[PDB]
Design a protein around this ligand. Structure first.
Ligand SMILES: Nc1nc2c(ncn2[C@@H]2O[C@H](COP(=O)(O)CP(=O)(O)OP(=O)(O)O)[C@@H](O)[C@H]2O)c(=O)[nH]1
Ligand SMILES: Nc1nc2c(ncn2[C@@H]2O[C@H](COP(=O)(O)CP(=O)(O)OP(=O)(O)O)[C@@H](O)[C@H]2O)c(=O)[nH]1
Ligand SMILES: O=P([O-])(O)O
Ligand SMILES: [Mn+2]
Ligand SMILES: [Mn+2]
Length: 1095
DNA sequence: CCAAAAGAAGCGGAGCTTC
């Protein structure tokens, strides 16, 4: 413990004494940090970090010497050096702003004078930066080493933070704003996704600052300072960036949206550099100079990423040896630029790519306001992908003369749901634009004979890219569908691309050519197909055609099928056998493929099946209210409105209802995963209203083209046969909107009753400003809920099985109950430590606990089995980071604003998270992990969770391996894993110790509704043990089912497209049998196995 | 439903208050 002397030698003039027990001013920087055993940052010890790093950046030679390396990134050239010189000068500006901000803080309310007189201002929420100041005559000044290093971190954050932010969707924006997800105004999601919240901005900035300071946290120092000091620095730097206009602050007033929402929420947006800024070609020079082991960098050639030790954002969970092996395998894969696609993108240019793939140039007077905001968001995503691709390309271009031969590696980590996530927002796994320019897939094909297997592979890739659903038809049938398309509608586009691949030029009408040819087949991968086919046509040597074109093996209705296989717990039923076949589990059909199943046996997948069951439930609901004309009319109007605007709903002339799989796809999925019906109703309404607002733009565009067009032809001209037709479609719309907003169904004692809202929609429609307001949205949702979603939910249960639903319920309940106890006990042990600390004269409220103290509290939870283990994966369902544990501000800026809450890694309630955690984890997660690590693991692939892109040379074997990996995952038993954790929990939990809040939360899960009011401790303890019994029985059933299934002849084609099924070679032959016969035989084998347990 | 949380700001020196 010579760590006190060490850090004092480096920072001898900081104000105060590095002694927690001292009477006067105590220095909490020196008390909180220590010098590392091995250098982490090259700025430690530097008198002037900004000067030193600026010199290092001033030339290649100086950079190489400072970094103690032989050769710098070749992207670090003259133009880039000049830009960094200018950026360093800007660093001086930020430093100067910070110094003045400190001066102002010291002067205001005499804080500096009081601090000098012994007022412990350095322990205030806004004064923690006084721990990094030094006496300066009658005042104080920043330690220059710490300030300048922090500014360097600030500059790196400014350059690359935006590219590393998370994506905000509707759920995220609802949590942030506190506005019900279904009622979010159009473009609010887009507004919030483009900016950072205060916590988002400060936490990322603070991480950078602490990293560059290059020290280690003292485990016996309070988090109020270890986390507090760098956060305080970050808050000041964010404030400085607002002053400099590097960051724009927008305080968004929620009361303008919902008058009873008091929240005012800060959004921070970094000012974007020019797309042509040379700094874009190497944006991490600072990072790679300051840090001995940089995080932010590209991995070129044989520079490979390290393997992460812990689960993403879950430091309590180590990646298992098998997970680390999978990560290593994926990080080993080489990606390469496909020059033709880069040149194609480049030649079209950003504007034309936006026109083709986004919304083009928006003119805000032919657009409905709400629709205009969605179109803005669509442009943003495409533009950001384009810009990010070309920044990467500029860096790749510097590495070699031939960009197509520069290997690129990507870092991955395991998420909390066991998926291998490629890090970054704009990479091949996450961004479709990028996916068609940077690829690991490569093959040299013999395309000289259209009868070759190589040519068949080529065709499969092209067809899939062109939106032919290749898994639904045999290879032979696919081939003919592709040929017709290539020689038909696509031919003018192919001709254009042939010319491009000859002269390098595109015509002025290139966008129109592609649009007209592709129609609804338009996608980035479709562009790759047109490119590659045209390249083949002009190829000199068709016998050795080199292409990155791929085939994606993708899981057919993957999550739902995995749940059905992994968690169905009773005896076998013929309906389950038929339905699981829809997912590619074929019993008694050696070598059967999904392609054959779809073409000869059953053309309806699981989602289509549930749609059919919805149609039955709907009929039953109508019969229950046959004599009720108001109810019948209300149902009619809902279905009418959906028919008007949604592609997956169709009503025939005589009233015949037709539904496509698309309406059930997400609802079925998220229902299994614990979604309420209300949320689904909200999403369906949003899809309807999206289409309405778009149709309103179609109106404004029709009126501009023709001022004497009728409202009926302006809104329904493109949709109608004649004009009288457009008139009856318009009448429908107005009638539907009136009744669906003025009247709502309410359930009263199991009966639906119509009620007047009093807030019905009436008035002339102004297509420009037209917006369906909150109360009217609520009414649409209520109609959608009771007349569509409830029937759909009934259909869902019928399709996936009541047995599965039961398993998922018990899983949810157990994991929720456990998480409630974990959360409450953590909080109680925290409050108990804080009551002790309140006796410590060295401790002040706002100082929190130490890391050791928190580590001890987490370790004390271990007899409650917080972790779920499978043998190859670890899940921590309760793991979170939240502000509710410390319930206090961590730091503010020096203006008493930017008040960052103190967030702590702690267990929190799971809610329904246990279901998707376990289903995604032991399903697609385990499948991919197995694919990366199994004997003969396919090489040169890109994995996208339940889909895998395969090079054309290896489509057969890699597909068969994928199906084998499915079979391997289907040997799992997530319920058994949950049970083993819950069983340990149950023998160590003391329900009497729980707070009243925790006991109430467990009551909801463990008890029937008529039990919460009067709940005793012993009642809910008894109820919790009952769930343990339920889990044990389900787990036993699953085990038997898997064992029995393994004995039988199986052909598995869940990872479909190629027609390469995995055969388990089970010896019991169930061929030439109905599902009823099969179920009987399987159940005989079940009982036989069940009687083997007994004895 | 899940894969990441997440109000601001005066006065005063924490945390109540009001918007
Ligand atoms: N918890 C959630 N999981 C989702 C959601 N969307 C997709 N997924 C998961 O990813 C899985 C694969 O998604 P895909 O895009 O391939 C669609 P899916 O496989 O369900 O059916 P196909 O259309 O046959 O591919 C899916 O089955 C779910 O387990 C979602 O909104 N929430
Ligand atoms: N857990 C979740 N996974 C998702 C969700 N959305 C997408 N995904 C996963 O990411 C994969 C890619 O999603 P995309 O947006 O590209 C939809 P697409 O049909 O184009 O994907 P493919 O299945 O690869 O054809 C998807 O298949 C799922 O496996 C989600 O909301 N939750
Ligand atoms: O093109 P699909 O059939 O693999 O989705
Ligand atoms: Mn899928
Ligand atoms: Mn997929």
């Amino acid at each position: 413990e010579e760590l006190k002397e060490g850090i004092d030698a480096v920072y001898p003039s900081l104000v105060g004494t590095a002694d927690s027990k001292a009477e006067g001013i105590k220095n909490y920087f020196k008390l909180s940090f220590t010098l590392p055993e091995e250098q982490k940052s090259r700025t430690v010890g530097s008198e002037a970090p900004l000067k030193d790093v600026a010199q290092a950046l001033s030339s290649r030679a100086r950079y190489e010497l400072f970094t103690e390396k032989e050769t710098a990134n070749p992207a670090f050239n003259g133009e880039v050096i000049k830009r960094y010189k200018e950026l360093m000068e800007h660093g001086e500006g930020i430093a100067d702003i910070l110094r003045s901000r400190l001066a102002k803080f010291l002067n205001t309310k005499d804080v500096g004078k009081r601090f000098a007189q012994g007022t412990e201002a350095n322990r205030w929420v806004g004064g923690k930066l006084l721990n990094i100041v030094e006496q300066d005559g009658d005042t104080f000044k920043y330690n220059e080493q710490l300030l300048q290093t922090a500014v360097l971190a600030g500059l790196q954050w400014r350059l690359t933070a935006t590219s590393n932010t998370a994506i905000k969707d509707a759920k995220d924006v609802a949590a942030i704003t506190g506005i019900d997800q279904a009622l979010l105004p159009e473009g609010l999601v887009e507004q919030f996704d483009t900016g950072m919240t205060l916590t988002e901005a400060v936490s990322s900035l603070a991480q950078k600052i602490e990293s560059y300071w290059g020290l280690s946290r003292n485990p016996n120092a309070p988090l109020g300072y270890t986390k507090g000091i760098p956060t305080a620095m970050a808050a000041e730097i964010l404030a400085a960036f607002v002053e400099s206009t590097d960051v724009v602050e927008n305080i968004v007033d929620m009361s303008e949206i919902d008058p009873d929402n008091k929240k005012t929420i800060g959004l921070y947006t970094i000012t974007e550099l020019d797309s042509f800024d040379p700094i874009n070609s190497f944006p991490t020079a600072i990072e790679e100079a300051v840090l001995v082991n940089p995080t932010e960098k590209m991995f070129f050639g044989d520079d490979i990423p390290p393997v992460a030790n812990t689960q993403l954002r879950n430091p309590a969970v180590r990646n298992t040896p098998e997970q680390k092996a999978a990560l290593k395998a994926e990080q080993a894969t080489e990606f390469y630029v496909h020059t033709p696609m880069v040149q194609f993108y480049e030649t079209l240019g950003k504007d034309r790519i936006l026109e083709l793939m986004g919304a083009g140039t928006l003119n805000k007077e032919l657009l409905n306001d709400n629709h205009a905001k969605s179109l803005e968001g669509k442009n943003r995503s495409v533009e950001d992908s384009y810009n990010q691709l070309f920044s990467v390309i500029e860096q790749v271009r510097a590495q070699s003369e031939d960009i197509s031969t520069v290997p690129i590696h990507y870092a991955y980590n395991m998420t909390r749901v066991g998926r291998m996530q490629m890090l970054g927002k704009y990479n091949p796994q996450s961004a479709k634009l990028v996916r068609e320019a940077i690829l690991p897939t490569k093959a040299t094909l013999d395309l000289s004979n259209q009868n070759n297997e190589d040519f068949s592979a080529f065709q499969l890739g092209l067809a899939q890219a062109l939106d032919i659903k290749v898994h639904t038809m045999t290879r032979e049938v696919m081939s003919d569908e592709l040929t017709k398309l290539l020689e038909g509608n696509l031919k003018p586009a192919i001709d254009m691309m042939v010319e491009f691949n000859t002269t390098g030029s595109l015509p002025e009408n290139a966008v129109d050519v592609l649009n007209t040819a592709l129609g609804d087949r338009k996608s980035f991968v479709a562009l790759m197909a047109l490119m590659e086919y045209s390249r083949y046509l002009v190829a000199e040597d068709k016998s050795a055609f080199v292409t990155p074109l791929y085939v994606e093996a993708d899981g057919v209705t993957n999550g739902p099928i995995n749940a059905m296989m992994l968690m169905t717990g009773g005896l076998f039923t013929p309906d389950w056998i038929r339905n699981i076949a829809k997912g590619g589990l074929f019993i008694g059909s050696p070598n059967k493929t999904m392609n054959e199943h779809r073409s000869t046996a059953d053309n309806n997948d699981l989602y289509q099946a549930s749609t059919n069951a919805l149609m039955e439930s709907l009929g039953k609901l109508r019969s229950n209210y046959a004599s009720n004309m108001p109810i019948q009319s209300q149902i009619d109007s809902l279905l009418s409105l959906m028919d008007l605007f949604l592609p997956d709903i169709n009503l025939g002339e005589n009233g015949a209802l037709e539904l496509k799989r698309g309406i059930a796809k997400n609802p079925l999925t998220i229902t299994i995963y614990g979604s309420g019906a209300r949320g689904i109703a909200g999403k369906l309404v949003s899809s309807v209203t999206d289409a309405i607002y778009e149709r309103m733009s179609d109106v404004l565009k029709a009126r501009a083209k023709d001022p004497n067009i009728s409202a009926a032809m302006a809104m329904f001209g493109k949709q109608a046969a004649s004009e009288a037709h457009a008139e009856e479609l318009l009448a429908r719309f107005l009638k539907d909107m009136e009744t669906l907003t003025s009247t709502v169904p309410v359930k009263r004692k199991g009966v639906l009753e119509l009620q007047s809202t009093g807030t019905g929609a009436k008035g002339k429609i102004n297509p420009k400003t037209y917006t369906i307001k909150g109360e009217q949205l609520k009414a649409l949702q209520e109609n959608m809920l009771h007349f569509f979603v409830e029937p759909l939910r009934n259909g869902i249960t019928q399709t996936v099985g009541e047995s599965l639903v039961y398993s998922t319920e018990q899983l949810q309940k157990a994991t929720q109950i456990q998480s409630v106890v974990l959360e409450d006990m953590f909080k109680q042990r925290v409050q108990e430590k804080l009551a002790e600390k309140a006796k410590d004269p060295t401790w002040k409220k706002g100082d929190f606990l130490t890391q050791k103290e928190l580590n001890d509290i987490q370790a004390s939870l271990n007899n409650l089995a917080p972790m779920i283990e499978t043998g190859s994966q670890t899940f921590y369902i309760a793991g979170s980071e939240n502000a509710e544990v410390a319930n206090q501000v961590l730091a503010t800026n020096l203006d008493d604003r930017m008040r960052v809450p103190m967030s702590i890694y702690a267990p929190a309630q799971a809610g329904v998270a246990g279901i998707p955690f376990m289903t995604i984890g032991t399903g697609d997660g385990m499948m991919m992990q197995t694919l990366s690590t199994m004997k003969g693991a396919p090489k040169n692939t890109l994995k996208i969770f339940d889909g895998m892109n395969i090079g054309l040379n290896d489509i057969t074997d890699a597909s068969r391996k994928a199906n084998e990996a499915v079979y391997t995952s289907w040997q799992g038993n997530p319920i058994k894993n949950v049970y083993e954790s819950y069983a340990k929990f149950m023998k160590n939990v003391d329900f009497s110790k729980l707070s009243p809040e925790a006991l109430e939360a467990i009551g909801k899960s463990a008890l029937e509704y008529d039990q919460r009011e009067n709940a005793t401790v012993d009642d809910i303890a008894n109820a919790a043990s009952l769930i343990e019994r339920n889990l044990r029985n389900i787990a036993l059933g699953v085990d038997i089912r898997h064992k029995v299934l393994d004995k039988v002849n199986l052909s598995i084609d869940q990872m479909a497209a190629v027609g390469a099924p995995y055969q388990n070679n089970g010896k019991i032959d169930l061929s030439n049998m109905t599902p009823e016969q099969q179920a009987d035989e399987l159940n005989k084998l079940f009982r036989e196995e069940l009687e083997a347990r007994k004895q």
